[PDB]
């Protein structure tokens, strides 16, 4: 306790607050006290001027305009008089940048300072160096199945929507994030992720590459589709339309790299002229949503699989569909992939099976080949075949890869890799040493 006269307290508090010097209160500092306790520059100069006591000298008044009559209206300012004196662009920018960054965390960026190396080359342009050869003949050798996982990759805080390699040979690898992001990777187990892409509002649903390999296409739930420069990250073109766009492909044919084929939730499939950006050809025949589109023979035909439990095969750029396959039995075909020989299709039907449909003119599913060691109740997925058609690898909800022997039609191997459900599984087209998977846990793994 203490019982200090309130008024003196006010005197000392204001004195210090205003000028910085106030006589110190202490009892036993020396057991006798001679000393001030302030910054003291003011104290020597100002001789302990009290706030209540008049200052010895006055300085530097600042004026505020006033009209006090009150006769005038609007006019009148009272003690409400706004100091006449007081009413960066350089900064105006940093703040904005910060805001943008924040938004992104909830505009494109470049990863790495490597840029163009040696002669002047795209990161995409050449691989040559990795053991083996990307140009490489189609069958590397009698194929192998992996045990050991090499790269986590990460980056994504959400499960990768999709994973795809690179036109020609697996030089680069490209991933789709539901955080509205797309990343490129060495694909050789190398740490570096090349250049990040950003520009979608909502999670990116699917992508496809330019057959030549320079352009790149993405489709997202934001109702937009973008064309990208793989060498700069530049959003070259954006394609409109109200419906959300599901799986999108780029015409494979050398003659018509230009045409986009986009499958829509709203039944239709639409061809887009890239140069015009205009609609070329609508396909209305399908009923219900469209899930996936492949090309059974390049240029000439493609197989669309739809929300209605049917397949529609078509010639290119012609609306009518020549062959329609449905059986009351088959539950659905969320993902369909085409063999490297161009001879077989493989659908992951919801019904927990894999169906082989002959690529050859007769699109008749064959009883001989079937796969049912794995469960996807109702998940989209990728099925791939080991080059040389020796093995088939399915990725499933439970998260365990299923490796089957095509020749012998039997689950040869199985892994419980991933702790969350796994989607796309890709066998490196040139190397038999490995496959690449992705799934909700947000990691890309190599087996």
Partner 1 sequence: DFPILCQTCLGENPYIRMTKEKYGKECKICARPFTVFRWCPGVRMRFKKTEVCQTCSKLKNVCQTCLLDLEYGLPIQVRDAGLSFKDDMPKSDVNKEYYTQNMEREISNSDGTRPVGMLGKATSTSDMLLKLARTTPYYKRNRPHICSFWVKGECKRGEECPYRHEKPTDPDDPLADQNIKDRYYGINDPVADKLLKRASTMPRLDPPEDKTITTLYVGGLGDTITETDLRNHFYQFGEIRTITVVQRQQCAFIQFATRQAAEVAAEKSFNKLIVNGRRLNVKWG
Partner RNA sequence: GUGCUCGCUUCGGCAGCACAUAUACUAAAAUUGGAACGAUACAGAGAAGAUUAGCAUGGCCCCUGCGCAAGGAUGACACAUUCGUGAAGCGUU
Partner RNA sequence: GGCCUCCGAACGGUAAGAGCCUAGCAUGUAGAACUGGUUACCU
Q: Which residues of this chain interact with RNA, rule CB under 7 A?
A: 10, 14, 17-18, 51-52, 54, 56-58, 68, 102
The secondary structure of 293-361, three-state, reads EEEEECCCEEEEEECCCCEEEEECCCCCEEEEECCCCCCCCCEEEECCCCCEEEEEECCCEEEEEECCC
Report how far residue 188's alpha carbon sits from residue 59's, in angstroms, rounded to the nearest whole number. Answer: 75
Q: How far is the CB of 413 from RNA (least distance, A)?
A: 32
- Cα distance from N-terminal residue to C-terminal residue, the chain: 75
Q: Choose the contact partner of 84 out of partner 1, RNA, none; CB within 5 to 8 A by kind.
A: none
Q: Choose the contact partner of 142 out of RNA, partner 1, none; CB within 5 to 8 A by kind.
A: none
Report how far residue 169's alpha carbon sits from residue 167's, in angstroms, rounded to the nearest whole number. Answer: 6
Q: Choose the contact partner of 54 out of RNA, partner 1, none; CB within 5 to 8 A by kind.
A: RNA
Q: How far is the CB of 233 from partner 1 (least distance, A)?
A: 20
Report how far residue 77's alpha carbon sits from residue 64's, in angstroms, rounded to the nearest whole number. Answer: 10
Q: Choose the contact partner of 99 out of partner 1, RNA, none; CB within 5 to 8 A by kind.
A: partner 1
DSSP three-state, residue 46: helix
Q: Choose the contact partner of 44 out of RNA, partner 1, none; CB within 5 to 8 A by kind.
A: none
In the block, which residue shows the tokens 């080991």? 386
Q: Choose the contact partner of 9 out of RNA, partner 1, none; CB within 5 to 8 A by kind.
A: partner 1
In this complex, which beta carbon is closest to partner 1, that of residue 49 or of residue 347?
49
In this complex, which beta carbon is closest to RNA, that of residue 10 or of residue 284?
10
CB 315, CB 298: distance < 8 Å: no
Q: How far is the CB of 329 from RNA (least distance, A)?
A: 22
Q: Choose the contact partner of 191 out of RNA, partner 1, none; CB within 5 to 8 A by kind.
A: none
In this complex, which beta carbon is closest to partner 1, that of residue 46 or of residue 437?
46
Report how far residue 210's alpha carbon sits from residue 216's, in angstroms, rounded to the nearest whole number. Answer: 6
Q: How far is the CB of 96 from RNA (least distance, A)?
A: 15
Q: How far is the CB of 377 from partner 1 (least distance, A)?
A: 36
Q: Choose the contact partner of 168 out of RNA, partner 1, none; CB within 5 to 8 A by kind.
A: none
Q: Choose the contact partner of 192 out of RNA, partner 1, none; CB within 5 to 8 A by kind.
A: none
Q: How far is the CB of 22 from partner 1 (least distance, A)?
A: 7
Q: How far is the CB of 17 from RNA (least distance, A)?
A: 5
In this complex, which beta carbon is closest to RNA, that of residue 20 or of residue 340?
20
In this complex, which beta carbon is closest to partner 1, that of residue 27 or of residue 73?
27
Q: What is the DSSP string of 198-218?
A: E--SS-EEEEEE-SSSSEEEE
In this complex, which beta carbon is closest to partner 1, that of residue 41 or of residue 94?
94
In the block, which residue shows the tokens 């993405």? 218
64 to 67, 78, 81: CA distances (angstroms): 10, 11, 6
Site residues (vs partner 1, CB under 8 A)? 9, 12-13, 16-17, 22, 24-25, 37, 86-87, 91-92, 94-96, 98-99, 101-102, 105
Four-residue CA torsion sign, 95, 99, 100, 101: positive
CA dihedral defined by 41, 42, 44, 49, rounded to 10 degrees? -170
205 to 41, 81, 183, 217: CA distances (angstroms): 69, 60, 14, 11
Q: Choose the contact partner of 419 out of RNA, partner 1, none; CB within 5 to 8 A by kind.
A: none
Report how far residue 430's alpha carbon sits from residue 394's, in angstroms, rounded to the nearest whole number. Answer: 19
In this complex, which beta carbon is closest to partner 1, that of residue 15 or of residue 292?
15
In this complex, which beta carbon is closest to partner 1, that of residue 92 or of residue 276?
92
**Strands of 279-283's sheet in order across:** 245-250, 259-264, 269-273, 279-283
CB 237, CB 277: distance < 8 Å: yes
CB 356, CB 365: distance < 8 Å: yes
Report how far residue 271's alpha carbon sits from residue 291's, in angstroms, rounded to the nearest whole number. Answer: 16
Question: After which residues are there C–N gaps above 2.5 Å in the chain?
Answer: 87, 106
217 closest CA partner among 275, 260, 277, 256: 260
Q: Choose the contact partner of 104 out of partner 1, RNA, none; CB within 5 to 8 A by kind.
A: none
């Amino acid at each position: 306790p203490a019982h200090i006269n309130d008024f003196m307290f006010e005197q000392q508090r204001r004195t210090f607050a205003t000028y910085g010097y106030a006589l110190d209160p202490s009892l036993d500092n020396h057991q006798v006290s001679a000393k001030y306790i302030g910054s003291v520059e003011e104290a020597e100069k100002n001789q302990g001027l009290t706030v209540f006591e008049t200052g010895q000298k006055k300085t530097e008044k600042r004026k505020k305009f006033k009209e006090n009559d009150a006769s005038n209206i609007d006019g009148f300012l009272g003690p409400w008089a706004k100091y006449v004196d007081e009413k960066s662009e350089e900064e105006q920018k940093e703040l904005d940048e910060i805001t943008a960054k924040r938004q992104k965390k909830g505009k494109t960026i470049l990863h790495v300072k490597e840029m163009y190396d040696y002669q002047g080359r795209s990161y995409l342009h050449i691989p040559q160096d990795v053991g083996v050869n990307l140009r490489s003949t189609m069958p590397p050798e009698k194929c192998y199945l992996p045990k050991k996982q090499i790269h986590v990759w990460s980056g994504h805080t959400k499960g990768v929507s999709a994973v795809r390699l690179f036109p020609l040979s697996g030089h680069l690898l490209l991933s789709c994030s539901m955080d509205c992001k797309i990343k490129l990777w060495e694909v050789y187990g190398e740490r570096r992720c090349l250049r990040t892409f950003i520009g979608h509002s909502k999670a990116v649903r699917d992508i496809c590459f330019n057959t030549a390999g320079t352009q790149f296409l993405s489709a997202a739930y934001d109702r937009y589709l973008k064309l990208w420069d793989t060498e700069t990250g530049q959003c070259i073109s954006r394609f409109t339309n109200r419906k959300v766009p599901y799986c999108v492909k780029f015409n494979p044919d050398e003659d018509k790299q230009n045409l986009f084929v986009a499958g829509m939730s709203d039944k239709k499939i639409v061809q887009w002229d890239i140069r015009s950006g205009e609609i070329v050809q609508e396909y209305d025949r399908h009923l219900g949503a469209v899930n996936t589109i492949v090309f059974v023979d390049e240029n000439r035909r493609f197989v669309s699989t739809s929300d209605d439990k049917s397949l529609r095969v078509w010639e290119w750029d012609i609306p009518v569909d020549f062959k329609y396959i449905a059986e009351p039995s088959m539950h659905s075909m969320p993902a369909v992939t085409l063999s490297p020989n161009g001879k077989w299709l493989a659908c992951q039907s919801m019904d927990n099976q894999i169906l082989i449909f002959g690529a050859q003119n007769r699109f008749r599913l064959n009883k001989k080949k079937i796969f049912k060691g794995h469960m996807v109740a109702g998940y989209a997925c990728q099925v791939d075949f080991s080059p040389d058609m020796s093995y088939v690898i399915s990725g499933d909800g439970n998260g365990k890869l299923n490796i089957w022997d095509w020749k012998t039609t039997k689950l040869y191997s199985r892994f419980k890799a991933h702790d969350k459900v796994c989607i796309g599984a890709v066998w490196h087209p040139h190397e038999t040493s490995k496959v690449i998977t992705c799934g909700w846990d947000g990691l890309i793994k190599l087996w």
